């Protein structure tokens, strides 16, 4: 089998991407944030504290003839941005772009943190990291990909995120018309439960490539590109007027600037992030100070190849017995 679904930016800055997901019988379609940095499929639901729901579409398990309460199971998660949510668990039928899993754990939120409530466009998350990170207790549950894997034509999914435009998640096949040149594959460590790999270096604009190992995770659920302070300093030094602001919480730059590109290495291959991808607009409405899309990972504890990086590439998440990551230009 295979599946294919369009993924759409939630706003004009590409802050995140939502993908429609069919849950239950009859189908309840929710728009989920596909997140290769976490491993829970959780949704706003009829059980969510009413004051914590503001415009989201909810899953109502009592209206699904295939929903079954997973007895005694609970979940609770906290993300790297400070947000959280928790609740109980059903199993139900879940389909993504024509690909169907029966008996998928669907984590129904009883509580969500304010940042989720405030974001009307995201109805929940669909985790695509390794199932070892799944938070369901006392019995850990598998991801949608993990459940689908054996049935897929090939045990892979691909992320093709657009810049200010729709893109695609495919399951089970590689669309060879969706990228240019070749796909360069690189080793993955699953030791921390992430799609963790090592970039071979970077360049700023038309500058010389610096060969240096950068360990990080491919994370579709993170907006920005978080890299070591040395790297980030080298980038923003090429933008006149850019500075790290403690009060704003990162590098800011004059909105009148033209940003240089940023290149990262995948083995001997090179992915070029155009400068425009690194502009995340005014820090506050009407400001002429703009927020940068490349920021320091110091104090995160890990480097994160988030959407800013991933949307510059066609990315293969290869879930073979020994997982690997593939990157191509597009």
From Swiss-Prot:
What UniProt keywords apply to this chain's record, in alphabetical order? Aspartyl protease, Disulfide bond, Hydrolase, Protease, Signal, Zymogen
| Domain of life (superkingdom) | Eukaryota
Disulphide connectivity of cysteines: 255-290
Please indicate if the UniProt record lists Hydrolase as a keyword: yes
GO MF annotations in UniProt: aspartic-type endopeptidase activity
**Membrane-traversing stretches:** none
Q: Which residues form the active site?
A: 35, 199
Q: Does the keyword Signal apply?
A: yes
Q: Which reaction does it catalyse?
A: Hydrolysis of proteins with specificity similar to that of pepsin A, prefers hydrophobic residues at P1 and P1', but does not cleave 14-Ala-|-Leu-15 in the B chain of insulin or Z-Glu-Tyr. Clots milk
What processes in GO biological process is this protein linked to? proteolysis
Q: Where is the Peptidase A1 domain?
A: 17-328
The EC number on file is 3.4.23.22
Q: Which family does it belong to?
A: Belongs to the peptidase A1 family.
What is the protein's name according to its record? Endothiapepsin
Full-protein residues shown: 90 to 419 of 419
């Amino acid at each position: 089998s295979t599946g294919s679904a369009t993924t759409t930016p939630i706003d004009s800055l590409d802050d995140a991407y939502i993908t429609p997901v069919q849950i239950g019988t009859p189908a309840q379609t929710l728009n989920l944030d596909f997140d290769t940095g976490s491993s829970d499929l959780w949704v706003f639901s009829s059980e969510t504290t009413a004051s914590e729901v503001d415009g989201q579409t909810i899953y109502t398990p009592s209206k699904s003839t295939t929903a079954k309460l997973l007895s005694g199971a609970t979940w609770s998660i906290s993300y790297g941005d400070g947000s959280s949510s928790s609740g109980d668990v059903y199993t139900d039928t879940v389909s993504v772009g024509g690909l169907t899993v029966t008996g998928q754990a669907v984590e129904s939120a009883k509580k969500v943190s304010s940042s989720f409530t405030e974001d009307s466009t995201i109805d929940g998350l669909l985790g695509l990291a390794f199932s070892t990170l799944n938070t369901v207790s006392p019995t850990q549950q598998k991801t949608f990909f993990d459940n689908a894997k054996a049935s897929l034509d090939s045990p892979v999914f691909t992320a093709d995120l657009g810049y200010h435009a729709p893109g695609t998640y495919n399951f089970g096949f590689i669309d060879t018309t969706a990228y240019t040149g070749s796909i360069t594959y690189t080793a993955v460590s699953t030791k921390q439960g992430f799609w963790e790999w090592t970039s071979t270096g970077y360049a700023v604009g038309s500058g010389t490539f610096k060969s240096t190992s950068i360990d990080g995770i491919a994370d579709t659920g993170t907006t920005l590109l978080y890299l070591p302070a040395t790297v980030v300093s080298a980038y923003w030094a090429q933008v006149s007027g850019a500075k790290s602001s403690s009060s704003v919480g990162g590098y800011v730059f004059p909105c009148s600037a033209t940003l240089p590109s940023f290149t990262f290495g995948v083995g001997s291959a090179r992915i070029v992030i155009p400068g425009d991808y690194i502009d995340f607009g005014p820090i506050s409405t009407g400001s002429s100070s703009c927020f940068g899309g490349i920021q320091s990972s110091a104090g995160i504890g890990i480097n994160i190849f988030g959407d800013v990086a991933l949307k510059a590439a066609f990315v293969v998440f290869n879930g073979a017995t020994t997982p690997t990551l593939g990157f191509a230009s597009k």
